[PDB]
From Swiss-Prot, chains A, B:
Function: Involved in the biosynthesis of coclaurine, a precursor of benzylisoquinoline alkaloids. Catalyzes the transfer of the S-methyl group of S-adenosyl-L-methionine (AdoMet) to the 6-hydroxyl group of norcoclaurine to form coclaurine.
Database matches in SUPFAM superfamilies: S-adenosyl-L-methionine-dependent methyltransferases, Winged helix' DNA-binding domain
GO annotation terms (biological process): alkaloid metabolic process; methylation
TM region(s), chain numbering: none
Full protein name: (RS)-norcoclaurine 6-O-methyltransferase
Tissue expression as described in the entry: Expressed in leaf primordia of rhizomes and root endodermis.
A molecular function (GO) term: protein dimerization activity
Keyword Nucleotide-binding on entry: no
Enzyme class (EC, first level): transferase
Coiled-coil region(s): none
PROSITE patterns in the record: SAM_OMT_II
Alphabetical list of Pfam families matching this protein: Dimerisation, Methyltransf_2
Recorded superkingdom: Eukaryota
């Protein structure tokens, strides 16, 4: 009756998955194999590696792990053992929008895992520093500046997540813009994000309004893409109150894009949605809300109701109705 | 069709499981709740914590994660939200042989996870240092000396694993000693381990023989408990050849206790067995062998055959037959 003990053992070693995968991305194993067009032997794979000579044995023991994770395949072809890609590894190949290689390099950076070791000090009072600041002795801004590459990759990461979010929005939720002729994108900075809407719906005038902050505009609809999960309840309701007055009684609305935590859910992203919240707490200081918490914010903002639409992304869409 | 992408996302964040669990052990959440005898509210649990005041919100968000991991329970009792222990958390309670709290504190120590960030340099040649030495700038011996507590816990850990191994051995595999009247425990140091055999089978004379090493004896059977996974093939076969000559043609045998890697296995410990091998490679420099590799060692030692017995432990038992 030891499946119980095994769950826990596997939870203890959950980091081994992260870090084996990290090495596979670092060594770019999946691309190399796909770019090869045919499954590669140990020595063939070895010779494609950045530096030489390679420790075949270490490479073999890591492959065995990747293969057991079911990300890579091991197959006997002729008298040779050849390694291919199991289906999940398509996200380990370059040259398509869902490539996760950057995400991986970022998330599994030793320094970016570091703050997760201060979960206990997050809970016990010592302090006002973020777990990040406690583990690295600087704030992220500073950190990113002193690590411009990590920063560049990180920005490209965020830019790419916005394309994917925006794209699922216009494609999956286009009906949400029916009747709309103007939209204000709050926190849309440059306007790259809203531009997806202007492009898909040329009949809609898209305005960006960033909020002053320390280091309104009228429309049929207001949009907030991943804004609110940064603001606490006070700010969220105020902004949500400004938005009410900015959109028309007759049909106006606010479209919110953010994670909806639902722990009682069997959706595959449930776990990751939870993880993003602890990550929020460790780094930014925001949180991800449950539907009940969204309900209450909206209710406390004087709104009539809301409708949640699920999309092919971590985040969800909340159409919040002011009148 | 995104279960594929979710596996990978969950693999990326596999470390979050390790580190949330780490905080739960650090805060000793499970014991406290069990010692309370009844499920506790946030504030009740908070007041039992080492230092004060506690960040209720951080504690709540970590609990939610633990509860989603199905280690803890969340239940509404009266008008209060109360947290209990899901079955896997029994291993998070003190006072029984299978308590895993020490294991957890050890394995999830930031410094002991550190070497897993050097998997890529394990593969690429720079160097002769262990991943451990590369991440901490010292060897373990030194390290342990400068961290006597971590060392004490670690030793107690190894001592406890030997009790459990030995105990499963005499209880599950007692028939393996039938007919045996003498046994030599190679690498049994003090003799604590073999003493389990002397105690269970008083009719057996138990000798310890440690091997000289830098910083034989005759018996019906020889025993090697977790010796061989440290020696490479050369040494393994030599030792296995000495053992042949030390035990009788008529029934003599060598009993090996060590992990048998079997990647094509649905046994719950398969993953962890793999993980222990990468851990070996990162720290000690040994490896864990597949049955085929054991077969070949034994075959190359001139043995007739072997029999594998599975026991309730990570390791397995190989009776290797010399004649
Ligand atoms: K780490």
């Amino acid at each position: 009756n030891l499946s119980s003990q095994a769950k826990l053992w596997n939870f203890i070693y959950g980091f081994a998955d992260s870090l084996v995968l990290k090495s596979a991305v670092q060594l770019d194993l999946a691309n190399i194999i796909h770019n090869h067009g045919s499954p590669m032997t140990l020595s063939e794979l070895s010779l494609h590696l950045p530096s030489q000579p390679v420790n075949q044995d270490a490479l073999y023991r890591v492959l065995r792990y990747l293969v057991h994770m079911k990300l890579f395949t091991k197959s006997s072809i002729d008298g040779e053992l050849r390694y291919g890609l199991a289906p999940p590894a398509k996200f380990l190949v370059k040259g398509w929008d869902k490539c996760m290689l950057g995400a991986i390099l970022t998330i599994t950076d030793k320094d970016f895992m570091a703050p997760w070791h201060y979960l206990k000090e997050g809970i016990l009072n010592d302090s006002t520093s973020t777990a990040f600041e406690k583990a690295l002795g600087t704030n992220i801004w500073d950190y990113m500046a002193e690590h411009p590459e990590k920063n560049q990759l990180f920005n490209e990461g965020m830019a790419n997540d916005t394309r994917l979010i925006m794209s699922a929005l216009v494609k999956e939720c286009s009906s949400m813009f029916d009747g709309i002729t103007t939209i204000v994108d709050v926190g849309g900075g440059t306007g790259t994000a809203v531009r997806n809407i202007a492009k898909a719906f040329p009949h809609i005038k898209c305005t960006v309004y960033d909020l002053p902050h320390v280091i309104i505009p009228n429309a049929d609809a207001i949009m907030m893409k991943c804004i609110l999960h940064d603001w606490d309840d006070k700010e969220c309701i105020e902004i949500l109150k400004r938005c009410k007055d900015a959109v028309p009684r007759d049909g106006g609305k606010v479209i919110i894009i953010d994670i909806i935590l639902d722990v009682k859910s069997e959706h595959p992203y449930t776990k990751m949605r939870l993880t993003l919240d602890l990550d929020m707490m460790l780094n930014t200081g925001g949180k991800e809300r449950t539907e009940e918490e969204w309900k209450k914010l909206i209710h406390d903002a004087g709104y009539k109701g809301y409708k949640i639409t699920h999309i092919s992304a971590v985040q969800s869409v909340i159409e919040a109705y002011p009148y």
